[PDB]
Design a protein around this ligand. Structure first.
Ligand code: ANP
Length: 341
């Protein structure tokens, strides 16, 4: 529950500097409050991490990672501006720039309809600037999702526009934002090239095939998540609506492409073994399904080209959503794609 988070009140004075105004959002580890500094009058987003000692330790690592990637670009290379940290008694507090709602929240306000394709193009360019920078810093975010991409404008300036819905061609109204600038947040699980690599990364629905199949992962795993984000920005819904790995894997074959024979072979030697039919070198589907509903769910999955009506964006998305991680393009290469010109 969200009651587990830091107890606050309007008019609170944190560390003899920050005046609490309101709550901006909650995670599972931290509560983010909008604060005004009493010395400079500037506004900040203060993330108050929970009392627990293990979350304090990870927040320190998060602070450390954030500090390393702060730069002098105009838009901070589309990475959330981090200004420093302090302790409020037992609480770790991280100081950020104040940002607007997530791209997910905007989807929610738009009735889970996708953004207009013109706006998708611009969000895409801006997210890629951030990913290209992280690549140059040898950093894998590991938690790319529309919830972790915030609108640069904290005032959320928008107006209603008319769009033909992608599914049926029905004329509907959605919100277009004035600003198209974005910032990446939530660098807690972020991993440098030289650092330790965990077995499971990503939010389940944005998880890369090589992570699920336990084949080892690198910075190219972020690229798979990015493709899921983009599909969601277009349709307003998750590309992979699932809660278990086996179903998730079978969905990948129905929507994108069959899993490369070499990857299924390398999976038999790892913890991805339980997903592979060793003899036939194929997915253990529908053998290892959990119910008939799970099978009907995977059967109901349309291939990507039926979902993505735009031709250049479809080609763009297939480039990204490559099951083989070695075949995925880098952010630098994607910025040269015809769709973004
Ligand atoms: N700079 C910011 N400006 C405005 N809102 C923010 C900002 N940073 C975070 N938030 C909001 O606070 C929520 C939690 O931020 P986050 O850094 O993800 O917290 P966390 O608990 O450490 N990680 P997670 O458990 O994965 O959410 C986000 O989902 C946003 O809604």
């Amino acid at each position: 529950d969200e009651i587990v988070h830091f107890s606050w009140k309007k008019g609170m004075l944190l560390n003899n500097a920050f005046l609490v105004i309101r709550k901006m959002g909650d995670g599972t580890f931290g509560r983010v409050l909008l604060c005004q500094h009493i010395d400079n009058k500037k506004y900040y987003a203060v993330k108050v991490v929970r009392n627990i000692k293990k979350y304090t330790r990870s927040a320190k690592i998060e602070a450390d990672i954030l500090k390393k990637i702060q730069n002098d670009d105009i838009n901070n290379n589309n990475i959330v501006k981090y200004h420093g940290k302090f302790m409020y008694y037992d609480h770790m507090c991280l100081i950020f720039e104040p940002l607007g709602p997530s791209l997910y929240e905007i989807i929610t306000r738009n009735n889970y309809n996708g953004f207009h394709i013109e706006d998708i193009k611009l969000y895409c360019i801006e997210i890629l600037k951030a990913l290209n920078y992280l690549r140059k810093m040898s950093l894998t975010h590991t938690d790319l999702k529309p919830e972790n991409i915030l609108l640069d404008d904290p005032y959320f300036e928008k107006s209603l526009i008319t769009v033909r819905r992608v599914t049926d061609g029905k004329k509907i109204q959605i919100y277009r934002t004035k600003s198209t600038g974005i910032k990446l947040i939530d660098f807690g699980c972020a991993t440098f090239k030289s650092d330790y690599h965990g077995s499971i990364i990503n939010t389940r629905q944005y998880r890369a095939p090589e992570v699920i199949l336990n084949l080892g992962w690198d910075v190219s795993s972020d690229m798979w998540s990015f493709g899921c984000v983009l599909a969601e920005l277009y349709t307003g819904s998750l590309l992979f609506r699932t809660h278990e790995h086996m179903e998730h894997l079978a969905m990948m074959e129905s929507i994108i492409q069959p899993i490369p024979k070499n990857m299924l072979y390398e999976a038999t030697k790892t913890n991805g073994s339980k997903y592979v039919n060793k003899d036939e070198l194929k997915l253990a589907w529908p053998e290892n399904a959990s119910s008939i509903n799970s099978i009907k769910h995977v059967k109901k999955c349309l291939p990507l080209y039926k979902i993505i009506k735009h031709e250049l964006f479809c080609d763009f998305l297939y480039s990204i959503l490559q099951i083989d991680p070695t075949l995925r393009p880098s952010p630098a290469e994607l910025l040269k794609h015809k769709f973004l010109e």
